[PDB]
Amino acid sequence: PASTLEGPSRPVTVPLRGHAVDLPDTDPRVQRRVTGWAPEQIAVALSAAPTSAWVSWITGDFQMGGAVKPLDPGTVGSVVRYGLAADSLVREATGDALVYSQLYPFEGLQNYTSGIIHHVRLQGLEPGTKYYYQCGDPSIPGAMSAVHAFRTMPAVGPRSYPGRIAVVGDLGLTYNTTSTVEHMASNQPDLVLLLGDVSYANLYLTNGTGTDCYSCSFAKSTPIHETYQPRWDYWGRYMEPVTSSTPMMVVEGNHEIEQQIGNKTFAAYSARFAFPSMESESFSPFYYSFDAGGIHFIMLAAYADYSKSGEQYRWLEKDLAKVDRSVTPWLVAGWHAPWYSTYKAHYREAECMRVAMEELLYSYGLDIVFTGHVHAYERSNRVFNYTLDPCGAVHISVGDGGNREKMATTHADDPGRCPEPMSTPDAFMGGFCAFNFTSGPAAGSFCWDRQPDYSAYRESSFGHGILEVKNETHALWKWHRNQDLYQGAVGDEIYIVREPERCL
Ligand SMILES: *[C@@H]1O[C@H](CO)[C@@H](O[C@@H]2O[C@H](CO)[C@@H](O)[C@H](O)[C@H]2NC(C)=O)[C@H](O)[C@H]1NC(C)=O
Ligand SMILES: *[C@@H]1O[C@H](CO)[C@@H](O)[C@H](O)[C@H]1NC(C)=O
Ligand SMILES: *[C@@H]1O[C@H](CO)[C@@H](O)[C@H](O)[C@H]1NC(C)=O
Ligand SMILES: *[C@@H]1O[C@H](CO)[C@@H](O)[C@H](O)[C@H]1NC(C)=O
Ligand SMILES: *[C@@H]1O[C@H](CO)[C@@H](O)[C@H](O)[C@H]1NC(C)=O
Ligand SMILES: *[C@@H]1O[C@H](CO)[C@@H](O)[C@H](O)[C@H]1NC(C)=O
Numbered sequence: 001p002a003s004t005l006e007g008p009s010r011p012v013t014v015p016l017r018g019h020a021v022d023l024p025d026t027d028p029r030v031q032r033r034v035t036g037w038a039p040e041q042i043a044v045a046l047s048a049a050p051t052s053a054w055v056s057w058i059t060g061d062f063q064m065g066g067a068v069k070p071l072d073p074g075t076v077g078s079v080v081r082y083g084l085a086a087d088s089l090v091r092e093a094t095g096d097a098l099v100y101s102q103l104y105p106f107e108g109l110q111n112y113t114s115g116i117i118h119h120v121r122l123q124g125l126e127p128g129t130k131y132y133y134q135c136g137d138p139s140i141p142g143a144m145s146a147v148h149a150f151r152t153m154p155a156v157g158p159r160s161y162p163g164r165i166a167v168v169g170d171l172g173l174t175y176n177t178t179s180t181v182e183h184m185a186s187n188q189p190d191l192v193l194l195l196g197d198v199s200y201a202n203l204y205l206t207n208g209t210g211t212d213c214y215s216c217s218f219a220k221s222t223p224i225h226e227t228y229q230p231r232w233d234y235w236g237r238y239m240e241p242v243t244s245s246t247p248m249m250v251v252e253g254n255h256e257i258e259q260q261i262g263n264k265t266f267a268a269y270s271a272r273f274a275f276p277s278m279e280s281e282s283f284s285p286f287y288y289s290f291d292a293g294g295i296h297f298i299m300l301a302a303y304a305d306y307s308k309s310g311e312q313y314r315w316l317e318k319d320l321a322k323v324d325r326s327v328t329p330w331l332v333a334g335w336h337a338p339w340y341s342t343y344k345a346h347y348r349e350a351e352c353m354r355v356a357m358e359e360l361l362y363s364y365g366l367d368i369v370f371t372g373h374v375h376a377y378e379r380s381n382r383v384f385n386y387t388l389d390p391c392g393a394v395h396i397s398v399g400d401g402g403n404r405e406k407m408a409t410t411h412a413d414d415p416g417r418c419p420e421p422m423s424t425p426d427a428f429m430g431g432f433c434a435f436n437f438t439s440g441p442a443a444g445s446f447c448w449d450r451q452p453d454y455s456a457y458r459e460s461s462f463g464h465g466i467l468e469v470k471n472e473t474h475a476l477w478k479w480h481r482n483q484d485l486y487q488g489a490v491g492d493e494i495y496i497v498r499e500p501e502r503c504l
């Protein structure tokens with residue numbers, strides 16, 4: 001495959017090629033397969049260091065409709081027994097239980113409240129080591145899970161890396177999602193990054209009717225942007241074969257906003273997943289950091305204040321200042337909204353985040369950015385501030401996970417498709433920062449009239465990516481399209497080569 005060491009490649013656009021259908025609530029993989037308080041939706045997450053990890057799960061069925069009565073989380077304990085062999089779970093950790101609700105005070109809308117969610121942090125783990133575990137409440141008969149196992153990240157060091165890191169976004173829960181996940185699992189990743197837009201529960205009215213496009217269908221006829229929270233539970237149940245054995249790090253996208261009573265947002269996202277918020281001192285579910293071998297990962301919030309005056313930015317400055325490149329040679333970031341996508345969908349939508357944060361990240365030698373949000377695949381050439389730059393990060397966007405919303409197919413540079421600038425900014429975060437270019441081929445315009453030179457590859461197909469960091473300077477990136485099922489199929493592949501003596 002090619003290498004970034006060669007400089008930028010001439011842009012490639014894959015010519016455009018069905019329907020994407022949500023899994024029904026009759027699918028056996030989304031049905032409740034346990035009873036009483038037995039654990040379901042079991043998921044592992046990393047802590048900030050390889051020597052610790054989170055185990056999470058839910059006990060009890062949710063409640064949808066009628067007079068929901070939130071469960072008392074104190075009625076079911078939070079216990080993980082673990083050890084180095086399946087028959088010797090001699091260590092114990094205890095954790096926290098909580099519930100969340102999704103409440104709408106409008107006639108005809110239905111309410112929701114969850115089962116009891118549990119989060120337990122395992123401490124004192126060996127890096128690179130397989131741990132067996134059971135979770136649940138031993139004091140309740142039948143309320144302990146089956147034995148599962150996961151492997152911690154390798155120790156932090158310049159020649160110590162997880163073998164394969166899967167990268168996906170905007171999964172939703174369609175049959176195309178199952179293809180994405182089946183492709184990914186067959187590549188046996190050591191770690192999964194989910195770059196926002198998880199269940200797409202907000203494509204449903206509270207009465208269970210879904211659409212491919214909420215604005216198109218329900219915006220003018222509903223008092224709020226509704227959700228059907230059971231889609232989250234279906235998603236967690238479907239994903240358990242992956243999450244119970246492979247650590248998954250999630251960061252929020254716009255579909256997690258899910259505004260409800262009293263302006264409350266992100267309830268399901270903030271409650272359902274474990275994040276290394278305390279350990280990375282972000283103290284926020286929306287952004288955080290962690291090490292996986294010699295890679296320092298930063299997950300940033302496109303949907304929390306990212307301005308230079310804000311708390312996330314101050315945290316990010318502190319987090320970057322602590323990075324020691326002789327210990328973690330790689331610096332990799334993920335967030336939901338791409339900064340350099342060339343599709344019409346969400347074109348320049350997160351520009352204010354780029355203007356706020358790009359220079360800081362460039363000054364610290366950010367190597368790679370992963371995003372979702374755009375329902376297509378794109379890889380940029382090394383770029384900084386809309387300029388090809390040998391020290392600029394590679395920006396890769398894999399928001400093509402298979403949800404039921406339309407694929408991004410039109411490009412902003414397509415004839416007649418350049419959007420009106422005032423229509424582009426994210427309305428949730430506000431501001432407008434997307435001015436016409438002042439230099440380069442597109443100077444004086446809002447869009448190019450051809451594929452921008454900082455776009456290396458773009459293709460409107462569903463899929464997932466795998467990152468194989470090899471050593472201090474080389475990493476192999478491969479993106480796999482869902483419609484290819486033959487052994488070894490690869491849609492896009494590149495060696496990302498860092499040059500720290502040049503750039504830092
Ligand atoms: C870091 O990893 C890269 C990729 O595996 C190494 O580059 C390869 O080295 C082998 C043996 O010399 C060659 O056959 C390959 O063609 C190289 N691939 C590329 C893209 O360059 C590199 O040698 C490693 N560097 C160190 C210090 O270990
Ligand atoms: C849903 O919860 C809201 C807020 O508590 C409440 O106003 C409303 O009556 C509830 N709806 C139903 C059908 O109970
Ligand atoms: C989604 O899955 C369906 C059914 O398997 C398939 O026909 C369709 O081509 C897939 N969509 C894309 C964009 O690959
Ligand atoms: C849900 O409510 C919408 C709008 O009132 C309605 O059009 C739709 O048919 C309802 N779905 C069900 C299953 O009742
Ligand atoms: C990015 O490009 C614009 C226009 O050239 C420039 O005004 C701005 O200062 C640049 N931002 C940087 C270098 O951070
Ligand atoms: C910016 O570029 C667009 C075309 O892409 C053009 O229509 C518009 O007038 C320009 N605005 C300014 C202030 O130059």
Ligand SMILES: [Fe+3]
Pocket residue numbers: 170197255373374399403
């Ligand atoms: Fe999405």
Ligand SMILES: [Fe+3]
Pocket residue numbers: 170196197253254255336372373374
């Ligand atoms: Fe999105």
